[PDB]
Design a binder for this molecule. Sequence first.
Ligand SMILES: [Mg+2]
Ligand SMILES: [Zn+2]
Lengths: 830, 57, 233, 224, 83, 608
Amino acid sequence: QCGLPKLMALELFKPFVMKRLVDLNHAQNIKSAKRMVERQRPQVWDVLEEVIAEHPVLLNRAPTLHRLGIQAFEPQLVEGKAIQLHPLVCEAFNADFDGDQMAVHLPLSAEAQAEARILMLSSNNILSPASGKPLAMPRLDMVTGLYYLTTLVEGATGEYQAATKDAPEQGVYSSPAEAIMAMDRGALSVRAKIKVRLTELRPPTDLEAQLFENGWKPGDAWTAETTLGRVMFNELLPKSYPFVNEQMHKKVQARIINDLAERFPMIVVAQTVDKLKDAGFYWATRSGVTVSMADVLVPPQKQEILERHEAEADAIERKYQRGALNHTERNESLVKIWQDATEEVGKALEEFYPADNPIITIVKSGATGNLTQTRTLAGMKGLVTNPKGEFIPRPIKSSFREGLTVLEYFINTHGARKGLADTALRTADSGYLTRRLVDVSQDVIVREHDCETERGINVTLAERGPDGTLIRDAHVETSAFARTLATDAVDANGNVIIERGHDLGDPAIDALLAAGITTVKVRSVLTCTSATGVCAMCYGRSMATGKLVDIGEAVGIVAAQSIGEPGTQLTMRTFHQGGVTGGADIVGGLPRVQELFEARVPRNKAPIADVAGRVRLEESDKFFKITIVPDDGGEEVVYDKLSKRQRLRVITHEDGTEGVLSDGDHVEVGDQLMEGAADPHEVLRVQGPREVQIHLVKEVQEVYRAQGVSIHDKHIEVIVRQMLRRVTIIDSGSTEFLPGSLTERAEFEAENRRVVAEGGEPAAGRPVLMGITKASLATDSWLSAASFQETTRVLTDAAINCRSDKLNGLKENVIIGKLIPAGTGISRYR
Amino acid sequence: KDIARLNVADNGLCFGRLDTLDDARLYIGRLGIFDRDNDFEPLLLDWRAPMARPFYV
Amino acid sequence: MLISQRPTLSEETVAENRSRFVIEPLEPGFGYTLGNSLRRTLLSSIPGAAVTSIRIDGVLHEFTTVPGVKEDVTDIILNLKGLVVSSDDDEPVTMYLRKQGPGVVTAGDIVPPAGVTVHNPDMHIATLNDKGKLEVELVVERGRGYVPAVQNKASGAEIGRIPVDSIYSPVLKVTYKVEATRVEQRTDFDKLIIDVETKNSISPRDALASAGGTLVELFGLARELNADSEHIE
Amino acid sequence: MLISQRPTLSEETVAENRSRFVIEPLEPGFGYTLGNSLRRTLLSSIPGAAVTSIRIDGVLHEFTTVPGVKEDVTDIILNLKGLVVSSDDDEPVTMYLRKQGPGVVTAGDIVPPAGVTVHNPDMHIATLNDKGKLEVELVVERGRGYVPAVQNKASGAEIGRIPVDSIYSPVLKVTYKVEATRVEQRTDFDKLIIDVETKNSISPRDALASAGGTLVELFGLARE
Amino acid sequence: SAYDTPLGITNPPIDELLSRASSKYALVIYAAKRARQINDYYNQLGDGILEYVGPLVEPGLQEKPLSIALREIHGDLLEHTEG
Amino acid sequence: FIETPYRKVENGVVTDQIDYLTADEEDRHVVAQANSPTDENGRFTEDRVMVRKKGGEVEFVSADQVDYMDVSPRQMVSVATAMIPFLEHDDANRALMGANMQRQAVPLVRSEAPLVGTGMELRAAIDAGDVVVADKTGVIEEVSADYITVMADDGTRQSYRLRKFARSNHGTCANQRPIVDAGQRVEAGQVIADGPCTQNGEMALGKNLLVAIMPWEGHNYEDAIILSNRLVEEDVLTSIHIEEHEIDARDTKLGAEEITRDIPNVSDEVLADLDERGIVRIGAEVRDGDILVGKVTPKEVRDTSLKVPHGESGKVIGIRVFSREDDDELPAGVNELVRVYVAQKRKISDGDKLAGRHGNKGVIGKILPVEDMPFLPDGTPVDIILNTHGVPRRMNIGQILETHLGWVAKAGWNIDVAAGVPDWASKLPEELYSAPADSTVATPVFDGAQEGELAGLLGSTLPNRDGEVMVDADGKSTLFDGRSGEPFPYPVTVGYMYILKLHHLVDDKIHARSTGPYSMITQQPLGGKAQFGGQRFGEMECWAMQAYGAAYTLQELLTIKSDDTVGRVKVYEAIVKGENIPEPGIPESFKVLLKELQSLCLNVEVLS
Ligand SMILES: [Mg+2]
Ligand SMILES: [Zn+2]
């Protein structure tokens, strides 16, 4: 639902209003109806309810960095001139109500009406097509309401204390309605521990396997030791969903909605998030969360901390004046000191504050904010930046409660102005990378269900150690989750615990964790043996729907968006006009990512083992020599011109603190020998077209993880499959492939295997690793070619070869003015 | 910046002692190392420091 | 003045002890003007009867179990708080339940005086185990709403007496929500929706009528001052 | 136990335009809701009388002046929007005003027709000088609530007539407290103390009467 | 099946239809084409009712053809073949 | 070069001598701070005083190293930034917001000046010029709405004419109004009239409103905010907006562009609000399309008159005509110009933007009847509800302090000194130990109300008319749900906040289009709102529309709406007739390229 004004719908829908006015004999013409609708007469207001019904409208807000920035809504006609927007669609849109505007588009053709009703409707896009996470989930007010409802307050009106045989129990209730009664009188708190008898609330499993042996049926009573708020919460979740009995921190609500989409339809999840909306709005008003200058408290150790640290900051300048220290190094020291102080203040401040405080409650509930802001407000602002971007070693010891002096305010303005441009240049960088990714991709549509292959990549699912239990890998919701299995999974015995073709998930992974497996072979697009694109079973399922992906689904654009959108959360190259190359230090954000996606040679390169075996290490002055001796073969290999600033590898096995690569060790093939990066071209000539893809995926995700960005690896898999899709030839074989020319690998196979007559020698070409830039120029159409330069070479080469345009990459169907061969515009569905 | 500097300094930290006319050992290297507890008393001077001068002049 | 369009009341039987009423079309603001009033009247105005206290033979200093029965004390109480009893004495009547013999006992096993009634005899109370008996005194009486336990007896004149929170109201769960509706083209009116869950001692509409009568009495006390110039429908 | 002590209504006179009522005894939980129902019906639905439109002689709209006067037509109207009146007829009736010279006009210069009354005859309207001539005609009408300017074209056959935003609510302030005082501290009860304050067009007693009557008419629906 | 009244557009539900077809795109087309059929049935009053079966279910006040179509599809009153 | 003043220190004792230095000179000395203490005719109390240096290098230094000193705080701030109370309590981006929103504040009908304010609101109005001040001492001889007449002591009579309902360059009103009575011995420089946003001679850009810092039932979510209907009944946040429309009767070489009433055949009912000369009659009300001035350009005669634009209305204030029969002046080829002014009273409404001086801004989500507004035990319903969640992450708590002090000023105070002056008042200026209700105070940006002077100063808070204290020493009251009737179970923070209405209104932003005029160069609709244009569907939007797998919406948007000129007509006709909206049987942008590639002797065969 979306609220639409009566003067902003009248225009959009004007022709239909004319039609209706003329069928109901209000207007005898289309000219009189046009006039009537221009003069806004009293009769064009009834009509506009019979036509605005069941007709969706698309709402958009720019910049649009992903598809949820356009959503379909059912119009509800409202008096006013502003658009009413559900508060759960506002995190995708990135919208707020400080003035922000929004655009409205209207479809006309049945096909587009249905695409809106089905693909775009907000009650279907509950999840991100990038991690599977829900977006339309309770935000700040809802969160604090549900966190106050479900919390536990010792010493609350009506609690349970067992009464020590004076009266038996003193706090037990035969139902939730009796507890409501007791709450109205004032005899019970909604946050007090009680024992209730529940019949329409399915219990948990730990107790359901202990109080019911044939399946808990609604009406089968049980007893719950919990609060009334947790009850009323669970009374919003679906019927068969168990009892949670937990403080509804944001992560809990996320978890629960994830489980609900795993185990239920999506209409149910929509209804449920609306229920939670209503309830959190209710219990935020009645949560007592407000602001005063007495709800903003200051720890009394602050001054002791600051004196104890001024001692140090004085001893430093003392040494500086003694000559023991330079000025820049003195500033570095002081900044290291006034960083170990704001830390102690934040510590003492999250300690001193109670839990019933609103300023801490709104934070620890996940509704908004951080403890950094709470320290800045009630503690100390701390250090601030110059316009160079360096640190002023004189900190701001004052809070925005004490009030800042004139100098402190002035020097905060410096970095307060330097944040309005950054927030803009970062968008241009992100846009650059996103356009690159959308250029190489945009032709990775799903075309066939199953490639019918048994290839795949291995994924670790857990790791144990000196203990018994298995520690589950922290990279499961992006590597193995939402995949398809290639091999039936088996334990030591030999039976199948999870079978082929199974779409992994939370249940499946918890199972495989209960039986103790620590590796599983999974299908990916890095291996899908499909000519045009990828197969569903190799891609997997869609993170938005949670069901296996469909045929025709553009999965490259999704990848580009998912990777580019968070490009502003990443470090970048300094924005200063001129200076020294800051690459002297390490810079591993967007630079590393552009590097990898173009496949250029890393800066802090390190050599990799050409052959397994052992190592012999020698050191001259500033030069490292390394000689690998093979264990089985011979012809020891060597790397000599190895810089000594470049540090050796650090191994760090479980027990031994091996660390530095040593003389008398073992190096496998692919082992990086120096701390740094590897050249994907070396990794390729050593290992092949399946390991380099994995090194690239792993490095890109390393980057996007160190910055706190979660992306499912299959998007990187798409982007990398579109980087290793061609071969260079030196032998044509029986096949006629000009030796010295690049060609595809699927064409390679087709033309070099079908030859059973004349097949005296197959074709022969080796693979080439390229970057998305080149890889986007290697297209195989003469319309996307002419789209670029060099139209004449192309048109001639193609007219002499009497080629044909298959119209797949969809970059050319817009030129022609034709449907895109994706989703709803492919023959299967067209 | 700090890390990079440390990584570099791993190679040949101390260049040499200076034994003064008052038995004040001054080790000279390529990084400042002070005792955060003992009045920031320097354990290793930087080669760019005014009291690292009587190693070059 | 005079009202516009004469609002109306409708009822929906989602169940037999539960129902959902709808009042519409209401002038704006008159949904919350009375919703909570109806709620609190229905919950705390209608008279009823309910167990106020119990006594048991075998539990007088250790109120955990009752030797001979599966159920503990808490469970038998929780069952005796859902007992649906009526009365006409307006005074503390006493009753007894006596179940010497291993088996299962219910409300069809109490002998109620001719002036008292029980509309849920089929309700489970306690499963008597092999070689188990059961005797329990009940103190039933009348009141309004939900009044909690009365342990203001420093030196009780009876021992083993156990007071219970008394659900005197035949109405157990009422809750309302008010939405918007539109008459011809003007909108932002109020549509009142109110769901009612009672016991089997009364139908929800009779409770609604009783609350309406109570509110009429009060606001006629208020109207009794001048009795002129109001709204009519 | 059943309590047969029905509730009782007792009035207390704090001033001429505000009173304080008591309703007692009452069931617990049952005071605040009645106070609020009454407060809302009072602040919302009490009939009244107010100025609906005005005509000054030489002006043509609210965005001009009148010679000799010190307050433009906009401030004149914003002041006329503080005028209490009381029409005992369910029709429009046009009052009249005409003052001259250096006077200081007041609400005690409108000559109202038979039926209408003005209760703030010391209300400031304007102040004139030797060249001032303030001639006006005000239209009074009956209604309730808050009704904005009835735009002119909607009425028809009018020029120089100036609609104004009508506010029909003799009630000025309402509130309530609840003393949960127990009878002989045997069982539980509530005492509802309402407090009402008017604008002199009617008394608090009569406003409470009208509110109670409306609420009766509403709650009666429950009963078949 | 344990949910509440699906409101407006959301009735008929989506997971119910997605099993009456292969996917969601195919449902887009499987609904649009029948919408065209319903419209061309309504517009054509002179030409006899042949080759245009009309709506297989009872319409409403107006119940725009797309809703009639998705309802019919919920009742399993249609067949379809891909290309 | 720009100069700023400093005070000359000589030995550590602040001299009263001034020096207007520039940056070059300043960089040579140690410039101190204004708040630095002084004990006996200047000398500093401390030993390590804080100063700046050449490169802004703030440092603590011995008070003997000092050479200059700042005359005042608020030296480095401007006018629109020395009018933000509690600025040292608000971070910098939201103070920027506050200033740049205090600029774009629309004048209101009746103005009201802030209870809690700053000392820099009297001068900013005198030193701007919309006030009127006495050129000479004297008494007042005549006072009308338009003219004011003064008789000075020298005997000379002055006459000040006042601007009444004149149109600023931004649509706002420019009405002046007198604030003096006949027989008033005014002095020189004394304010004689107030301007559009002044009251008694000090900037009054907004109004004080009763605010409760609390979340409500979802209608103040994500910086949105709530209002009473009182602010609409009493015309509190109402504003007058004026519009200017001009038309010229210039030469065409086919005759004369004539302005007349004998318009081509049209409804005489449109020609009723027009005077003899075909121009509209003052006092009438208009509406989109309604004629304003009938202009006939010769053909014999056509109709190109000035009609009201889209989304506009109002009363015709007045007219400004400029003829050539006077030869006053008109540009090359003109014979007449007519300017028509129309006025509209605009009330606060759902969508209109609203703000405070601290960067706190938002739109208006809900306007509530006063009977369902959180009210106080005395019956006072609050006027604006603001949420808690936006305050700490936006770092603008100056508004909390403003709320508190607004309460402390609307309800007076009496510090009980019977037993001495409390320790939190040992720094207070006497004459600030008491004040009545509706008082006005000043908190200068960096020398103003502290938190000791404001914590215990919230307890005093003279009671209400009934002896009841409605707000405690922490800033909080106890409210009642005007819907339920029960008191919210926790005390809420209540006070008075100065709130500003802004030029960002929704009657100026709501834009929609179905059909209309195109650009005939790119052959798409025009871009803009006055142009009556469409909305840009860009590239990123096409990506987002592809990732759904939606092909028909994209086709629709890129052909039937912007470029396809033979399809939009088919579509309009289809819809008006109620037939299936058609589909391009074969793409249409392809044909010119098809021709010109065939013309180049390259066979092309659209296959099938
Ligand atoms: Mg914004
Ligand atoms: Zn595959």
